[PDB]
Amino acid sequence: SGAIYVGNYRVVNRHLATHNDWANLVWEDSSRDLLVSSTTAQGCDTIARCDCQTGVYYCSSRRKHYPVSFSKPSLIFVEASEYYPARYQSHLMLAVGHSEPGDCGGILRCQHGVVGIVSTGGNGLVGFADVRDLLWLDEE
Ligand SMILES: CSc1ccccc1CC(=O)N1CCC[C@H]2C(=O)NC[C@H]21
Ligand SMILES: [Zn+2]
């Protein structure tokens, strides 16, 4: 589990969104595994606006933050899981690292801010849904 809290937005994995998220929906995209809902309180996270390929992510199944090198956002075939059939996720970045399903939501960050959230994994790879192209998270 986990979310990004920027401005009056809450960014979560679409597959982990709650009824309150869906009842206060701003935007969702199943191909990216992302959903954004509105919040009453303002958040403290800042979104990175960059092309970094190195950063640090939180792994809840290890209670640890790990430094990683990750790929540029791309269209990756991802194997079937409990929440999705086997399909080609978009805007996904891969790194070598440990993950189990409940680590979805952990933040990946660089020197500029939040880069994305854990979305997939398997065989020692972890997959992050990028948010750096969602410029509208910075306003309104
Ligand atoms: C961070 S999500 C994760 C991490 C480690 C293991 C599994 C998951 C998610 C998950 O349920 N599956 C099904 C089993 C095969 C895996 C794969 O290659 N793609 C999806 C993935
Ligand atoms: Zn950066």
Going from the Cα of 111 to the center of ligand 2, the distance in angstroms, rounded, reads 5
Which distant-in-sequence residues (6+ apart) come within 8 Å of 39 by Cβ?
5, 8, 9, 10, 24
- Non-local (6+) Cβ contacts of 63 within 8 A are none
H/E segment holding residue 65: strand 64-69
How far, in Å, CA of 52 to CA of 95, rounded? 13
Would you give the DSSP letter of residue 84?
Answer: S
Per the CB < 8 A criterion, the answer to whether 5 and 43 are in contact is yes
Residues in the chain: 140
Distance from C-alpha of 64 to C-alpha of 58, rounded to nearest angstrom = 6
CA-nearest residue, atom 11 of ligand 1: 81
Task: Please check whether residue 11 is in contact with residue 4, taking contact to mean a CB–CB distance below 8 angstroms.
Answer: yes
Q: What method did the depositors use to determine the structure?
A: X-ray
Cα angle vertex 56, ends 16, 63, to 5°?
Answer: 65
The total of other beta-carbon atoms located within 10 Å of residue 34's CB is 25
From the list 21, 91, 103, 104, the catalytic residue is: 104
| Atom 20 (ligand 1) nearest CA | 79
Active-site residue among 21, 33, 103, 130? Answer: 33
Q: Are 56 and 70 in contact (CB under 8 A)?
A: no
Which atom from ligand 1 is nearest to the alpha carbon of 101? 2
The token duo for 120 is 């997939």
| Side chain identity at residue 2, one-letter code | G
* Amino acid, res. 54: T
C-alpha–C-alpha distance, residues 125 and 121, integer Å: 5
Is 104 a residue of the active site? yes
- In 10 A of CB 110, how many CB atoms? 17
- Does 99 sit in the ligand 1 pocket, CB within 6 Å? yes
Output phi, psi for 104, to 5 deg: -60, 135
Q: Please give the resolution of this entry in Å, rounded to 1 decimal.
A: 1.2
**Single-letter residue type at 85:** P
Tokens matching residue 63: 């209670």
Phi, psi of 137, rounded to the nearest 5 degrees:
-60, -25
Q: Report CA(114)–ligand 2 centroid distance (Å).
A: 8
Q: Is 54 exposed, middle or buried (0-12, 13-18, 19+ CB in 10 A)?
A: exposed
